[PDB]
């Protein structure tokens, strides 16, 4: 019916998808090894849209996880949520990889394991006779997720041409350049494949993570154990129309169709306010829906590093405001009434704009059926500031003679560096041209 195959790949893409499947059992009322609660069918009306359909009421995840590093998968099998995963769909015990840290490693390893990489991931494709598409849950940081992920964006474009492609990709961190220095090279090589060899992306910045991780979360030493908490909730938040029973844009080709203006303009800004557990003691007094979307357009919950004074000459075109759970829908048109009076979104002068709001009932659970949740999927034309940030860090590195002799020994014979530079400037010029 609407079966999606997630493509978890890389050192960071496997960990953000590990707790994504772990989030799904707590809201479906199911255990990874059994069914102890009856809340799975009376409370939740649809479960076989991301999981594989049941053979013994055991909803297998439709997931594949490949990585060169064996460290990310050795921290999985000792956890009690790995018995839900199957040891025959992806790998058996003692799976390995390369050495290995290179963008050209996984780019060259795709055609030497070409027979095996297109054998076991295609067995899940013909399980349903109407496949939705493929989401590449991969990474941009490092050479593991960026090297091999650029290969599958090409060969799955023609072997599966009538399928939706759209990824939840995480952006790397640009604070210092000591541990990694190959960061401007492997990022722009995948970013070219994300626009012409891929339809849509969902950007997730790393410098904007610790802006939120010290905002309300109150940590002193930033660890990697907090990167899975902001990411796994908004992943399950994006499929609330798709997993839980909704009516309009209840498919993944429903939501993405109403937000993309044009190809190579698909970078969607994400926002999510409620992350604090001591808000729970004051939501008993009928906290309404009239105050939760006034702060979405206000740049506080954003996960995109952008300029603060560059929003006057940029214009919103498509903005999504997803409320979940208890909505009190007699005032949801009242919340959309107050949008035109502030004009917090700059509107495009050539065409109409749209503020789309939708709702779906959440899990039968006490932290879910009590507190209001707001998921934002914006589309603003100030996203070229990240593309100006990555390009200015790209041409400055090529004048310092950095990784021009250390990178072209394997499988690179011609200069494909300006092939990425002009196509990035094509994106940056067509964005500003789009508001005439």
């Amino acid at each position: 019916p609407r079966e999606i195959i997630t493509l978890q790949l890389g050192q960071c893409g496997n960990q953000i998808g590990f707790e994504f499947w772990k989030q799904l059992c707590a809201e479906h009322g199911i255990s990874p090894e059994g069914i102890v609660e009856e809340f799975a069918t009376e409370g939740t009306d649809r479960k076989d849209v991301f999981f594989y359909q049941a053979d013994d009421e055991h909803y297998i995840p439709r997931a594949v996880l490949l990585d060169l590093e064996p460290r990310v998968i050795h921290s999985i099998l000792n956890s009690p949520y790995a018995n839900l995963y199957n040891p025959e769909n992806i790998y058996l015990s003692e799976h390995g990889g390369g050495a290995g840290n290179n963008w050209a490693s996984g780019f060259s390893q795709g055609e030497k394991i070409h027979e095996d990489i297109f054998d076991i991931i295609d067995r899940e494709a013909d399980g349903s006779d109407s496949l939705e598409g493929f989401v590449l849950c991969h990474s941009i940081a490092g050479g593991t997720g960026s090297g091999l992920g650029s290969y599958l964006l090409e060969r799955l474009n023609d072997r599966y041409p009538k399928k939706l492609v759209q990824t939840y990709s995480v952006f790397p961190n640009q604070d210092e350049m000591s541990h990694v220095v190959v960061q401007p090279y492997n990022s722009l090589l995948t970013l070219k494949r994300l626009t012409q060899n891929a339809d849509c992306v969902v950007v997730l910045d790393n410098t904007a993570l610790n802006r939120i991780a010290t905002d309300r979360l109150h940590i002193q030493n930033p660890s990697f154990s907090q990167i899975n908490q902001l990411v796994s909730t908004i992943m399950s938040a994006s499929t609330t129309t798709l997993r839980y029973p909704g009516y309009m844009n209840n498919d993944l080709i429903g939501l993405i169709a109403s937000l993309i203006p044009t190809p190579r303009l698909h970078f969607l800004m994400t926002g999510y306010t409620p992350l604090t557990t001591d808000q729970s003691v004051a939501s008993v007094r009928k906290t309404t829906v009239l105050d939760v979307m006034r702060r979405l357009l206000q740049p506080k919950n954003v996960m995109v590093s952008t300029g603060r004074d560059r929003q006057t000459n940029h214009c919103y075109i498509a903005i999504l405001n997803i409320i979940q759970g208890e909505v009190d829908p007699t005032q949801v048109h009242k919340s959309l009434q107050r949008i035109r009076e502030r004009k917090l979104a700059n509107f495009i002068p050539w065409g109409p704009a749209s503020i789309q709001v939708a709702l779906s009932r959440k899990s039968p659970y006490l932290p879910s059926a009590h507190r209001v949740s707001g998921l934002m999927m914006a589309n603003h034309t100030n996203i070229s500031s990240l593309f100006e940030r990555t390009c200015r860090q790209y041409d400055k590195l090529r004048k310092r003679e950095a990784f021009l002799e250390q990178f072209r020994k394997e499988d690179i014979f011609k200069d494909n560096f300006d092939e990425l530079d002009n196509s990035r400037e094509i994106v940056q010029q067509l964005i500003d041209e789009y508001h005439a």
């Binding site: 309404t288 009239l290 105050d291 009242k334 009434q337 107050r338 035109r340 009076e341």
Partner: protein
Amino acid sequence: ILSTGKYLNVVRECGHDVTCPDAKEITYTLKEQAYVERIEKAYNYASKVLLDFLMEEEELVAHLRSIKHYFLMDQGDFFVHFMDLTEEELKKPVDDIIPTRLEALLELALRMSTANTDPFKDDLKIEL
């Protein structure tokens, strides 16, 4: 005896069993003088138990407060927020779609001021 039965019909038309002179239905007397003293105890209870039901159990004292907060402009914290918000819409001659936008900014000035007697302010309409 006119005004008592005026009270008794408007409480008969409300519930037909919610009548004010309950537990006082004592019969009349045959006397040349003392039947006005019979009326003098029938008045005093029937209008007293009509007062506290409307004023306290139906909160008619709270309805004049919301009248005071807007017409007399007493609670001015939400009001000057709304009064600043009538400025950007009345800096032009009046149109038909403007009162559909005044109620947008009224309840946007209301629930940013987070009061708990706000159900008494949802009975307010805007005339332009």
